[PDB]
């Protein structure tokens, strides 16, 4: 009967999928996740959703390694973000299995975004209320950072920010982001943006770095590493 | 709110009636059947001069002998045309004969009510005029979104359908010639449109008994009909 | 087409008053005389009996199917039974569908009935779904050990058709290894189906 | 009104308002009359005329060699039901080799429409049938309704103007049983006031179902 | 049709069915968790509907596998669904990999199932929040999984009735260097604060992952000893 | 295997050997070939132990299914068990190679139904199955009496299964007897020492 | 599976979901496709990109095949799905038929995807208008089909989609010529987009497919030269 | 029901299934059908208020064949009545297919109440606006399934218009102490007494499953009882 | 806010499944009360038997049901839902016996019913089955009388004594106030019927109540015949 159906995959008078717009709002009310693309790699830095003196910072709530060459930061619902992270990991491994090559970052982004968009356009199910900052490396586009939203729309960003106070982080990145940054410089910029738009415990970091011989490596900074990075700032 | 399959308290399928309205919003098309064949004349609504008129097609050759002209949603009419072409070629394959005009019209109409909810989501927003040659006899049918095909001798579908019917009521006769059928179709189209009728804004076609073929008129033939028109 | 538990020969033949079917009441497991007093015929309608020669498990499957279909049509038609023609048509279709599904019923099925129009209907569907209507049908060694005894008297008096069927089943008892027991006779007449007393049809044993 | 949204929703008075809306669709169809005799059945229908230059859209259809249906309501629903009826006839002939009975076809149509009303998302057939068939069960006339029920009638009138035809049939009801095929056709034509718009399909215990229109019907128009 | 999500974003970007399921959790019976240095504890108020209830027949503190145990606050029946799913997932994990499902993997599976029911159509979210305790390489780990499928680790927690006051009480009374004994005492104390009337051993269930890495549900006798110690 | 179900006036006597044969090896010499479908429905099993045990399992399942929607659990249960075994043997005719004598007691009294490996279900007062039953056919014919009581039928069934045991390599061991009357089923085991005769009747 | 009738006729005969998909297209960025006898030029306005946004490999322009360029206006993910289907279809046409898919055929396929979404229960319409252009063969005239969210498609001498479609289309009509050269078509598209872009060099991108060639993005230097020549 | 009467699977705040009792109202609107378990058999009478005099007198059955031994009187929404009749025939046929025996009216009643219950238990279905009285003399069973699916065996069942007065009258007669042949006059008396004068032409479709029919569902011969009334 | 929470089994703003509680109300609409007492030596369930007509066959108006030969189920609630849960419990027991090879325990059957009620209270397209099920019987593996009560919510718990129906609250109060470790099955049956009679407020006759007293001598489920029920009722009236 669809009496209580919300018509999730239905346009609104303005031509917007209301469920996708509300998912975007949910993201904008979530912890800030900033991505900064430096010379060889990308620094992702997210605000943990679940913090407090009684919370145990054992795992990255928002940072999720997708593959040896791709890491992600989450803004919004960490649950459906985890679902899409599982799908992204499976897609990267399927690409590796098919081609014996690490999935190009844009293809993994396209896959997760096609999942999101399939939820926005078919099935009458709510969209994934998560925005991903997918940092990655591939031989084609070098090191990349992609911002993906619940609509399934993604774009490459040298630097960007999502979540709470994402506009302030974006403005700070515009003011201070420079090309050809070093890993240290980009980490400092991300820490500065996070602090200016918001504590090491609450914050989590992940540096993708491409070395010529070692390849692309994802390193999600632990509590102690993030504490050291914050104290450096 | 209510399902697309809802019957109104009057007993009308609300979505079918709304699809008929969508047809009423479509380009005017007039089919005139004469003992010498049947003629489609459809308005091509050239919104811009950069619009390729040849690509804006209401007339579709379903088969060598039968064709259709659309009024309403061009894409839904395209789906109906695809079904009709598949069914005309399937009939040619299954029975080694051209599909009957009634047969292909009924085939496309059986798809009209196939919409549902809880298949298509909605009725077709296009009405068809299916004119063809079956066993050397010219047949013409009109189908509405309800899936109700009725054989016609002179029908009009689209923007000026009511006005075209009023004009044909005292302009169409059962013993006209092919030239007279062309003149009547083109005149009815001109009088039930909001633009001038030239070889570019009109698409003409004929299911001709003489050739037993549904041929869509070239620019020269449309120019000839336009020139011969008295006004 | 595997026949482990086999119903033996059937000899049906039209006579003036109906169809006289005959068959031993024995099911043979291989060459063994396994079961006795097992009617190879099942009355499926008041004027329609069905017998089968060959796999009796397949005959039971078929009889269950026929009875289910007859019950369905009785529900549709206020208890009115399918005609012998309709029942045989369904048996033909079912057995051909089973041969086309590659799970054929290894039983030659005889449908002997009286159609509502009073016409004697004697038809037979082989395990392959090949079916035919005859005035007399032999299945198993009732077909082979038959000669002209039935053809010469088919549609004759009940006594003549009974005598011819008795000759055929004397041949069957003499020359069929799976022939065991008395030969039950069944008259499908417009007045119903009558199971005549089974007869021990003895081969002439003065031959020794 | 609020209960009139689905064929699955009963109203507080135990009614399916969408089924009644499909019924009203049928009632707004062209007049259709059916008559039954001991040996013949007839369905005469005033075929709809959407325009003066449109041949009257056929409503008297040929289903089985001895069954014909007059569809009143949504023509496309009637055509889908006729495809279903052809499937049932084909399967009955396949299974038993005999022509299905019009009573069995009426039962199948009733079941199909009842299914269309017992599940959401699917809609009652806007079409109502007058199916006449002369089989082993004799000549039988059935009015199949969108709700999913059929009524066996000696005579019936459905669609618009049906009241006058129904009254006329009631007046001559007791005559119909013994009336000859020609007499039955004449009764159908009288009961069904519009000539060319009137088709008339007649079936008999012996004769197959055949449709007469205009000239073929003139001998009985009287 | 069924497969339309009844958990959908509202105008404010909030899944209102998620908040409703969290409310169902908040009326679902106080359950506490406390991470010790050498283990973790999941206690919970298990006040039976009647004394005639047989406690062992429906226990809120449950074992998912040898190393992972689970308590819940919320709807008992869909907690049992989640628990069957988690035990099945850990058995599948052992079949595939020869070891019990890791604590974090059990938590991620519970979170995935809850998120699934938050997104698929025809279903409501699970009205339970799970406190899953188990060991990992770095030490004991208490985890909370919400009806939304969002999971996160805790040092101490309360989920059910009066869980805000219980969480404040844990903030005040929880310490990092607690032993499993002290974690059990802290969980019992938190239950006492979140429970009115005499808090006895039969009214609470305690599960513990201790130095041995194995989850065990303390019997009523052990709970009595802890209450009297 | 030897199976011999006798429907007596006062009950059903289902006798069998206990020998499962794997070629010339007896993996199970104390085989219970008469499976208890229900307290008074038993399935003497002949053929592939896997197939016949699946048939017993599936007929228990089908008899429980029969009782999902009814309260007269004791009605037509032997007949339904036979019908179900027949349907399973026919349906799995390619796969299953199994013949079941389903005998016992229900509301309809004592009933024995032999479902042959072909899937031919027949109600019998004396049903026999298995390679060993062959050797006792004439014996049964000359020693079975329709008037045998459950005691007389039990003695006769023990003697017949003992003859089949002696003569059949595939039949051997004890005689598993099930006596099903209205009051229930009693199981007996006639070990070779208690059997009426042994190998010494062969040529003597 | 979800099969709600998302797209249904309104009482006035309009598919409001198609209207909302058109609104989504309008909120999409402007594309202009222009044709010279031996060239097809698609100029798309780059969305306002900050200094922090990578401007490479995110153009709205795409190649459905070595002979088929595509550009879109509207929801980027809807258009991504359409482009994926269109590329799969071009390869599928090559598989089924050795011939490359005709621009009419591929434009029909994409418009039929949009039509199916307007007809499929539980499927939102594609909020995407697609300018699908290319050459059927070496000797075939360049084609520029525009497929709308409604699933209708029409060939155009020059067309625009997205925001400012009115203004860009007016510019095209004022400045279109029957036999424009490659340079003239490039200038037409570039100026048509220049009228409604805050910056010429930055906000504007161009991709041209010459006869017997593949999709080719304009060099920034050559694009700037053409922009300055237009101004 | 303040919105609790549109979805069949929706309970009222009081636990009422409003769609189910609307189906029950559909049953109540229909002409009364009553079964009586007699000593010689079971007699299913069904009042047929012929709306049109043109209806075939020997047609429009309210009582249907389910088996060679099971009849089904129907009350309420005739489409649902015949849908349930065909589903009961299918249930009996499937029962024979599974178990090889004929279903019993109690078991058929359970299996068909399964479908009744599915109507208002799973979404997307409509409650069956019908009560079905299955009578079998072989089973000595007279089980009525109500639209909810609540099925009960009856000594004398009755549903439809004036079914309360009909039940009261059926109480006055010890049907198991009388035969179906001598129960026919009593049942016809009850139906005629409770019959509404709004219909001048009407019938009493009377089936019986008795020793005379060998338990078969047989419409009572017109010689025994003339169903036609004017 | 949409009203799905009050018509479907989705949580309300208070996190309550309104349809589940309305199915509790529908259970109470059965107008009968069931009291089950499980002692060490027996489990007696007594559910008052109300027949609305004299023309309804009383044997068909039952709330005791054989699930398995061992497990009985006293189902209180909507008669259609009661029949559905009877057949569902029987199917659960049959599937369990087929997969596992032994008769389903009362505890596992209760858990399976709880899972069905959980899928009803979670799947919005499935109604909560308005049945309070008192599953009972002698579990052989423990050789002890299991007595589980499963609510329409699916809340399943083993009980030393439980009640369902209209007077479930009063019956539960009486049970938890006067329960004992009764020494004999006769004592258990007397207490069960006395509690039911007291809470119902009507002196019962055997016809007016169905009693299933599963003892170790008779562990198979069966409704006690009216003579044994009358003897129990006389014993109750004896004190």
Residue numbers in the entry:
A (entry chain C): 2 to 199, 205 to 239
B (entry chain E): 9 to 126, 134 to 246
C (entry chain N): 1 to 208
D (entry chain F): 4 to 197, 206 to 233
E (entry chain B): 3 to 231
F (entry chain H): 1 to 204
G (entry chain D): 3 to 233
H (entry chain G): 5 to 234
Give sentences from the paper.
The proteasome is a proteolytic enzyme complex essential for protein homeostasis in mammalian cells and protozoan parasites like Trichomonas vaginalis (Tv), the cause of the most common, non-viral sexually transmitted disease. The 20S core particle forms a cylindrical structure consisting of four stacked rings, comprised of two inner rings of seven different β subunits and two outer rings of seven different α subunits. Importantly, three of the β subunits, β1, β2 and β5, have proteolytic activity and are therefore responsible for protein degradation. We address this challenge by creating a recombinant protozoan proteasome by expressing all seven α and seven β subunits of Tv20S alongside the Ump-1 chaperone in insect cells.
By comparison, CP-17 bound to four of six catalytic subunits, corresponding to β2 and β5 from each β-ring. For CP-17, the α,β-epoxyketone group is covalently bound to Thr-1 forming a morpholino derivative. Beyond the S1 pocket, the P2 tryptophan of CP-17 interacts with the β2 active site through its indole ring that resides on the hydrophilic ridge of the shallow S2 pocket, whereas the indole ring of the P3 tryptophan is buried and fits well within the deep S3 pocket. In contrast, the density of CP-17 in the β5 site was clearly defined. The ligand was positioned in a highly similar conformation to that observed in the β2 site. The α,β-epoxyketone group was covalently bound to Thr-1 and the P1 phenylalanine is located in the S1 pocket, which is lined with Lys33, Ala46, and Ala69. The P3 indole is anchored in the relatively deep S3 pocket, defined by π–π interaction with the residue Phe27. Finally, the hexyl group of CP-17 sits in a well-defined shallow pocket formed by the hydrophobic parts of four residues belonging to the neighboring β6 chain (Tyr116, Asp136, Pro137, and Val138). For instance, the arrangement of the S2 substrate binding pocket in the β1 subunit prevents interactions with CP-17. Despite this relatively high sequence identity, the fine structural variances within the active site pockets present opportunities for designing selective inhibitors targeting Tv20S over human 20S, as illustrated by CP-17, which inhibits the Tv20S β5 subunit with a 10-fold higher potency than the equivalent subunit of the human constitutive proteasome.
